Write an enzyme that holds these catalytic residues in place. Structure first.
Site, PDB file in Angstrom:
ATOM      1  N   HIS B  72     -14.896   3.835  36.016  1.00  0.00           N
ATOM      2  CA  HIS B  72     -15.259   3.448  34.652  1.00  0.00           C
ATOM      3  C   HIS B  72     -14.602   4.357  33.637  1.00  0.00           C
ATOM      4  O   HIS B  72     -14.765   5.579  33.696  1.00  0.00           O
ATOM      5  CB  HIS B  72     -16.771   3.523  34.420  1.00  0.00           C
ATOM      6  CG  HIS B  72     -17.551   2.482  35.156  1.00  0.00           C
ATOM      7  ND1 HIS B  72     -18.851   2.159  34.827  1.00  0.00           N
ATOM      8  CD2 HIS B  72     -17.231   1.719  36.225  1.00  0.00           C
ATOM      9  CE1 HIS B  72     -19.298   1.242  35.664  1.00  0.00           C
ATOM     10  NE2 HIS B  72     -18.336   0.959  36.523  1.00  0.00           N
ATOM     11  N   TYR B 201     -26.723   2.380  28.274  1.00  0.00           N
ATOM     12  CA  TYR B 201     -27.919   3.168  28.018  1.00  0.00           C
ATOM     13  C   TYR B 201     -28.487   2.573  26.744  1.00  0.00           C
ATOM     14  O   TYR B 201     -27.777   2.448  25.749  1.00  0.00           O
ATOM     15  CB  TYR B 201     -27.548   4.630  27.805  1.00  0.00           C
ATOM     16  CG  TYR B 201     -27.129   5.332  29.077  1.00  0.00           C
ATOM     17  CD1 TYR B 201     -28.068   5.994  29.881  1.00  0.00           C
ATOM     18  CD2 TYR B 201     -25.797   5.339  29.481  1.00  0.00           C
ATOM     19  CE1 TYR B 201     -27.679   6.649  31.048  1.00  0.00           C
ATOM     20  CE2 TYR B 201     -25.401   5.990  30.649  1.00  0.00           C
ATOM     21  CZ  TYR B 201     -26.345   6.640  31.420  1.00  0.00           C
ATOM     22  OH  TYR B 201     -25.947   7.273  32.562  1.00  0.00           O
ATOM     23  N   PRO B 293     -32.156  12.319  35.348  1.00  0.00           N
ATOM     24  CA  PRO B 293     -31.078  11.370  35.647  1.00  0.00           C
ATOM     25  C   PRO B 293     -30.311  10.853  34.436  1.00  0.00           C
ATOM     26  O   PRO B 293     -29.189  10.370  34.574  1.00  0.00           O
ATOM     27  CB  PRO B 293     -31.805  10.232  36.355  1.00  0.00           C
ATOM     28  CG  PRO B 293     -32.971  10.905  36.979  1.00  0.00           C
ATOM     29  CD  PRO B 293     -33.431  11.853  35.916  1.00  0.00           C
ATOM     30  N   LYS B 297     -26.358  13.619  36.484  1.00  0.00           N
ATOM     31  CA  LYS B 297     -25.857  14.926  36.842  1.00  0.00           C
ATOM     32  C   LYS B 297     -26.390  15.583  38.106  1.00  0.00           C
ATOM     33  O   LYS B 297     -25.893  16.625  38.502  1.00  0.00           O
ATOM     34  CB  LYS B 297     -26.078  15.856  35.647  1.00  0.00           C
ATOM     35  CG  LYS B 297     -25.344  15.430  34.379  1.00  0.00           C
ATOM     36  CD  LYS B 297     -23.965  16.082  34.311  1.00  0.00           C
ATOM     37  CE  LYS B 297     -23.088  15.513  33.201  1.00  0.00           C
ATOM     38  NZ  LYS B 297     -22.563  14.162  33.546  1.00  0.00           N
ATOM     39  N   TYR B 385     -20.195  13.709  29.534  1.00  0.00           N
ATOM     40  CA  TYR B 385     -20.491  12.635  30.480  1.00  0.00           C
ATOM     41  C   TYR B 385     -19.583  12.688  31.707  1.00  0.00           C
ATOM     42  O   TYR B 385     -20.054  12.561  32.836  1.00  0.00           O
ATOM     43  CB  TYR B 385     -20.369  11.258  29.820  1.00  0.00           C
ATOM     44  CG  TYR B 385     -21.077  10.179  30.604  1.00  0.00           C
ATOM     45  CD1 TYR B 385     -22.458  10.044  30.535  1.00  0.00           C
ATOM     46  CD2 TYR B 385     -20.376   9.315  31.437  1.00  0.00           C
ATOM     47  CE1 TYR B 385     -23.133   9.073  31.277  1.00  0.00           C
ATOM     48  CE2 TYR B 385     -21.035   8.345  32.183  1.00  0.00           C
ATOM     49  CZ  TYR B 385     -22.414   8.230  32.100  1.00  0.00           C
ATOM     50  OH  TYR B 385     -23.091   7.298  32.858  1.00  0.00           O
TER      51      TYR B 385
HETATM   52  C1  LIG Z   1     -33.228   7.666  39.457  1.00  0.00           C
HETATM   53  C2  LIG Z   1     -32.335   8.792  39.897  1.00  0.00           C
HETATM   54  C3  LIG Z   1     -30.972   8.507  39.908  1.00  0.00           C
HETATM   55  C4  LIG Z   1     -29.985   9.475  40.335  1.00  0.00           C
HETATM   56  N1  LIG Z   1     -28.679   9.080  40.143  1.00  0.00           N
HETATM   57  C5  LIG Z   1     -27.723  10.053  40.304  1.00  0.00           C
HETATM   58  C6  LIG Z   1     -26.427   9.687  39.811  1.00  0.00           C
HETATM   59  O1  LIG Z   1     -26.014   8.599  39.400  1.00  0.00           O
HETATM   60  N2  LIG Z   1     -25.533  10.721  39.754  1.00  0.00           N
HETATM   61  C7  LIG Z   1     -25.768  12.025  40.118  1.00  0.00           C
HETATM   62  O2  LIG Z   1     -24.889  12.865  39.897  1.00  0.00           O
HETATM   63  N3  LIG Z   1     -27.013  12.338  40.613  1.00  0.00           N
HETATM   64  C8  LIG Z   1     -27.942  11.376  40.692  1.00  0.00           C
HETATM   65  N4  LIG Z   1     -29.318  11.676  41.117  1.00  0.00           N
HETATM   66  C9  LIG Z   1     -29.622  12.930  41.807  1.00  0.00           C
HETATM   67  C10 LIG Z   1     -29.305  13.086  43.311  1.00  0.00           C
HETATM   68  O3  LIG Z   1     -30.033  12.069  43.992  1.00  0.00           O
HETATM   69  C11 LIG Z   1     -29.677  14.445  43.887  1.00  0.00           C
HETATM   70  O4  LIG Z   1     -29.418  15.492  42.934  1.00  0.00           O
HETATM   71  C12 LIG Z   1     -29.002  14.707  45.262  1.00  0.00           C
HETATM   72  O5  LIG Z   1     -29.597  13.959  46.311  1.00  0.00           O
HETATM   73  C13 LIG Z   1     -29.172  16.117  45.730  1.00  0.00           C
HETATM   74  O6  LIG Z   1     -28.528  16.318  46.960  1.00  0.00           O
HETATM   75  P1  LIG Z   1     -28.847  17.548  47.900  1.00  0.00           P
HETATM   76  O7  LIG Z   1     -27.963  17.487  49.090  1.00  0.00           O
HETATM   77  O8  LIG Z   1     -28.838  18.750  47.035  1.00  0.00           O
HETATM   78  O9  LIG Z   1     -30.357  17.273  48.397  1.00  0.00           O
HETATM   79  P2  LIG Z   1     -30.979  16.038  49.201  1.00  0.00           P
HETATM   80  O10 LIG Z   1     -30.163  14.831  49.093  1.00  0.00           O
HETATM   81  O11 LIG Z   1     -32.391  15.966  48.786  1.00  0.00           O
HETATM   82  O12 LIG Z   1     -30.845  16.563  50.642  1.00  0.00           O
HETATM   83  C14 LIG Z   1     -31.532  17.625  51.256  1.00  0.00           C
HETATM   84  C15 LIG Z   1     -31.550  17.377  52.783  1.00  0.00           C
HETATM   85  O13 LIG Z   1     -32.113  18.473  53.535  1.00  0.00           O
HETATM   86  C16 LIG Z   1     -33.258  18.078  54.264  1.00  0.00           C
HETATM   87  N5  LIG Z   1     -34.266  19.174  54.296  1.00  0.00           N
HETATM   88  C17 LIG Z   1     -35.423  19.343  53.549  1.00  0.00           C
HETATM   89  N6  LIG Z   1     -36.245  20.205  54.038  1.00  0.00           N
HETATM   90  C18 LIG Z   1     -35.619  20.652  55.187  1.00  0.00           C
HETATM   91  C19 LIG Z   1     -36.000  21.605  56.136  1.00  0.00           C
HETATM   92  N7  LIG Z   1     -37.193  22.149  56.063  1.00  0.00           N
HETATM   93  N8  LIG Z   1     -35.173  21.878  57.158  1.00  0.00           N
HETATM   94  C20 LIG Z   1     -34.028  21.201  57.206  1.00  0.00           C
HETATM   95  N9  LIG Z   1     -33.549  20.263  56.374  1.00  0.00           N
HETATM   96  C21 LIG Z   1     -34.415  20.036  55.361  1.00  0.00           C
HETATM   97  C22 LIG Z   1     -33.680  16.814  53.613  1.00  0.00           C
HETATM   98  O14 LIG Z   1     -34.523  16.056  54.464  1.00  0.00           O
HETATM   99  C23 LIG Z   1     -32.380  16.181  53.163  1.00  0.00           C
HETATM  100  O15 LIG Z   1     -31.638  15.457  54.111  1.00  0.00           O
HETATM  101  C24 LIG Z   1     -30.416  10.778  40.772  1.00  0.00           C
HETATM  102  C25 LIG Z   1     -31.830  11.094  40.768  1.00  0.00           C
HETATM  103  C26 LIG Z   1     -32.800  10.153  40.345  1.00  0.00           C
HETATM  104  C27 LIG Z   1     -34.298  10.623  40.401  1.00  0.00           C
END
Ligand SMILES: Cc1cc2nc3c(=O)[nH]c(=O)nc-3n(C[C@H](O)[C@H](O)[C@H](O)COP(=O)(O)OP(=O)(O)OC[C@H]3O[C@@H](n4cnc5c(N)ncnc54)[C@H](O)[C@@H]3O)c2cc1C
Ligand SMILES: Cc1cc2nc3c(=O)[nH]c(=O)nc-3n(C[C@H](O)[C@H](O)[C@H](O)COP(=O)(O)OP(=O)(O)OC[C@H]3O[C@@H](n4cnc5c(N)ncnc54)[C@H](O)[C@@H]3O)c2cc1C
Ligand SMILES: NC(=O)C1=CN([C@@H]2O[C@H](COP(=O)(O)OP(=O)(O)OC[C@H]3O[C@@H](n4cnc5c(N)ncnc54)[C@H](OP(=O)(O)O)[C@@H]3O)[C@@H](O)[C@H]2O)C=CC1
Ligand SMILES: NC(=O)C1=CN([C@@H]2O[C@H](COP(=O)(O)OP(=O)(O)OC[C@H]3O[C@@H](n4cnc5c(N)ncnc54)[C@H](OP(=O)(O)O)[C@@H]3O)[C@@H](O)[C@H]2O)C=CC1
EC number: 1.14.13.2
Lengths: 394, 394
Positions: B72, B201, B293, B297, B385
């Site tokens: 986009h 938005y 969200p 980010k 953005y």
């Molecule tokens: C409505 C909404 C829309 C979103 N849209 C976007 C978007 O368009 N763009 C964007 O940039 N971000 C977006 N996000 C955010 C994004 O989903 C997260 O920031 C992202 O998943 C974070 O990734 P992570 O790997 O840090 O953690 P997670 O994806 O939460 O992964 C952590 C992993 O570790 C595991 N874990 C937890 N505890 C333990 C443990 N005790 N031992 C071992 N493993 C464990 C979990 O089970 C999981 O698999 C959105 C959020 C919301 C609420």
């Protein structure tokens, strides 16, 4: 779902608060993450303070404990080859301690609840708390595949150290106090008879050891070990051999060893959060504090929090005195810190710390020598071991 | 088990750090609590910043994203019936955003790892961290029924907001910053075509709404709702009807509604911990911060933490510059706070807050009017953005 008091946790804390509330007539619901079997599947002995024992009677769940529990009038400390007995009964008036496992206590409580039909939801996953600031707090959780909501007046977080209720209070509003000791307790449960009819805490150059008992038919032993030790490197005989080396020969000599029914290593730590409440949420037990086992105080503090919270809850409901709940934290905290102190003291005089110098070694030996050899000293321990009196609310 | 970098988490953060490290030649192991299916079972769209897209290329996992992603060049904001386009491409030089779901990104990463044979342990329960202060840190966890230990040089906590790595740093050493908004995002995924080829938005008296898309074949829509709303009280048509009411008629008119493939309510919140490291433990992604969200980010910050941490890890290993890792927090934190600011800004100008007075209503409308009507203003949004540039280490 709708109820008066929401209770997160079906452990001793939750169950005890729930039952007491049940008998008082206050509606309550307990949400437990695990399954009945799982909860009940966690094994753990227990030394209960008179207060804990009195609270179970009042809860109407003292039948079995009265038939299977062991009332100890004294406890022993060993060091420098000698054994010194602290007459708990005499040195404190008449208070005693009762040996009845936590597992059993939990079990007894689940049967009392299952029977009276009070509400309890197991396998309540993804519990989350809401509106703690308002006066219509509620809880969400997923069960059997659907999304559920539970409304209430007050939530009591009894979900333990790893629970979510403490993790639901804005971090900034809480002050955390903690100490992580440089050692843990390697434990061995056996069906062999106890080497003594009263517990034996032993200080020894090689390290701390403990002779206790879960029930009349099973022994419970402990030896301190560095935090990096792997339970799998400790075969029964290696355990039994180290245990004997930390005991006076007279004791190690009449000790009956056997195959370990259960073994494990439990790290020691102190943890206290202030305050222990936020709006309509109140923390109890392990959810708010942790004490090293050396003082036999974990389950007992949990019980005093419950007692205080129950009693304040009555006032609130049964008298519209909902303000008295503001004093929940300050009350429990005063008893919690005194408990932390006594457990920290017990730990320091009984264990081997690393990099300790000659002076520290001598002071420790002298701490034991003076306290165990003085009536005043023997009293400070006695009144603390049996448990300090519960503070009245008003 | 023995490895160089221990990685808690097989989410986008863990997987991305793991793959990058794999290609650099640094040994790494990923411990995931869930099952491959479970992880991959969480559905979530995604708007990726150029930085995120460049990082995936470097990780060698950009094949599918290049074939299925949607680039986009602009994004839209609607308010007062009008639609204003922010030429992201022009207003920032040439940076763009790519729409490719997180689920897909995660999936792509798991296949790349599964193939190269790098180490990954799923269903790694009861993870616990040890010796973070020393130089021989290690991790314990239970799998398939046995107790395991994993030694390493540094642990990277990528376990998300509910993980245990953040919960493993002495609370006192951390400062928490957070804001909980008074509303959430009710979302509806559909296989109906998007009402627009760029996101929309929308600010509206009734409340915020969002027109987005998970892929070329599925639409993603959102409407803000009070935190106490139950997803089950929102039937598809009630959603579609509210969505249209918050959009300019020209848009709501050509919108293709359909049965919701997935629906849910996600609460908004800001969370930042300082610092984001402790000894040999470094936090990345959701384990250290959360952003509403509105700024798209969450995943993107996670990626920049990973980039910074990866790059510093190289220096450390590949040059014995293990000190440069002390600067991990300060670097990420500078980009994190700027991201929090832009997301907080987006949230404030787009949403309906409660008890807001006439003045606040007018200022909000004027914020949109001025920024969208000025080149300087349109640039502040554009450069934010698409994502601010990653800060170089040395
Ligand atoms: C409505 C909404 C829309 C979103 N849209 C976007 C978007 O368009 N763009 C964007 O940039 N971000 C977006 N996000 C955010 C994004 O989903 C997260 O920031 C992202 O998943 C974070 O990734 P992570 O790997 O840090 O953690 P997670 O994806 O939460 O992964 C952590 C992993 O570790 C595991 N874990 C937890 N505890 C333990 C443990 N005790 N031992 C071992 N493993 C464990 C979990 O089970 C999981 O698999 C959105 C959020 C919301 C609420
Ligand atoms: C070696 C050792 C020996 C001990 N011996 C004694 C002793 O002799 N005497 C003594 O006084 N104390 C003793 N203790 C301490 C005692 O075990 C604890 O203090 C006690 O279990 C705390 O009870 P609780 O109900 O507060 O929490 P727990 O027993 O931990 O129960 C909490 C319950 O809530 C559940 N829960 C957690 N998260 C959630 C969630 N998200 N949603 C819903 N439910 C959830 C849990 O699964 C659990 O069932 C000992 C400790 C150690 C380490
Ligand atoms: N135990 C602990 O360690 C901690 C507990 N807390 C407390 O727990 C809560 C944490 O807040 P929060 O986790 O947000 O609330 P929840 O755990 O209830 O949020 C889960 C909801 O968020 C959705 N969601 C998350 N990420 C995405 C995404 N990328 N795309 C689409 N939907 C998404 C979930 O989707 P799905 O079901 O698909 O995943 C789901 O609808 C607060 O009460 C906080 O005070 C805070 C810190 C730690
Ligand atoms: N995720 C989170 O919310 C949090 C994580 N933490 C961190 O997690 C760790 C928490 O420490 P901790 O829970 O003690 O370590 P563990 O979770 O590893 O301790 C489990 C071991 O303690 C034993 N144990 C506990 N209670 C008893 C009992 N009453 N009787 C006999 N054995 C018992 C366990 O037995 P069994 O297997 O039988 O249960 C087991 O041997 C630290 O790393 C801390 O920094 C700290 C706070 C929160």
């Amino acid at each position: 779902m709708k109820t008066q008091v929401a209770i997160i946790g079906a452990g001793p804390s939750g169950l005890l608060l729930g039952q007491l509330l049940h008998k008082a007539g206050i509606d309550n619901v307990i949400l437990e993450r695990q399954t009945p079997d799982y909860v009940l599947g966690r094994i753990r002995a227990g030394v209960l303070e008179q207060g804990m024992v009195d609270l179970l009677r009042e809860a109407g769940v003292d039948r079995r404990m009265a038939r299977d529990g062991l009332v100890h009038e004294g406890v022993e400390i060993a060091f420098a080859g000698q054994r010194r007995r602290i007459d708990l009964k005499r040195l404190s008036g008449g208070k005693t301690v009762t040996v009845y496992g936590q597992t059993e206590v939990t079990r007894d409580l689940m049967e009392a609840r299952e029977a009276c039909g009070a509400t309890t939801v197991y396998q309540a996953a993804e519990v989350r708390l809401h509106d703690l600031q308002g006066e219509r707090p509620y809880v969400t959780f997923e069960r059997d595949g659907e999304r559920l909501r539970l409304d209430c007046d007050y939530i009591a977080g009894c979900d333990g150290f790893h629970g979510i209720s403490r993790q639901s209070i804005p971090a900034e509003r809480l002050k955390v106090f903690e100490r992580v000791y440089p050692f843990g307790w390697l434990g061995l449960l056996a069906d062999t008879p106890p080497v003594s009819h009263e517990l034996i805490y032993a200080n020894h150059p090689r390290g701390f050891a403990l002779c206790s008992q879960r029930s009349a038919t099973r022994s419970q032993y402990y030896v301190q070990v560095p935090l990096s030790e792997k339970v799998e490197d400790w075969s029964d005989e290696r355990f039994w051999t180290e245990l004997k080396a930390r005991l006076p020969s007279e004791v190690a000599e009449k000790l009956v060893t056997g195959p370990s029914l259960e073994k494990s290593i439990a790290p020691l730590r102190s943890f206290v959060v202030e305050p222990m409440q936020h709006g309509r949420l109140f923390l109890a037990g392990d959810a708010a504090h942790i004490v090293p086992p050396t003082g036999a105080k974990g389950l007992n503090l949990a019980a005093s929090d419950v007692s205080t919270l129950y009693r304040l809850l009555l006032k609130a409901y049964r008298e519209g005195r909902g303000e008295l709940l503001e004093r929940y934290s300050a009350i429990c905290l005063r008893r919690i810190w005194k408990a932390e102190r006594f457990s920290w003291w017990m730990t320091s005089v009984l264990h081997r710390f690393p990099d300790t110098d000659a002076f520290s070694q001598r002071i420790q030996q002298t701490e034991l020598e003076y306290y165990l050899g003085s009536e005043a000293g023997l009293a400070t321990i006695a009144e603390n071991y049996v448990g300090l009196p519960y503070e009245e609310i008003e």
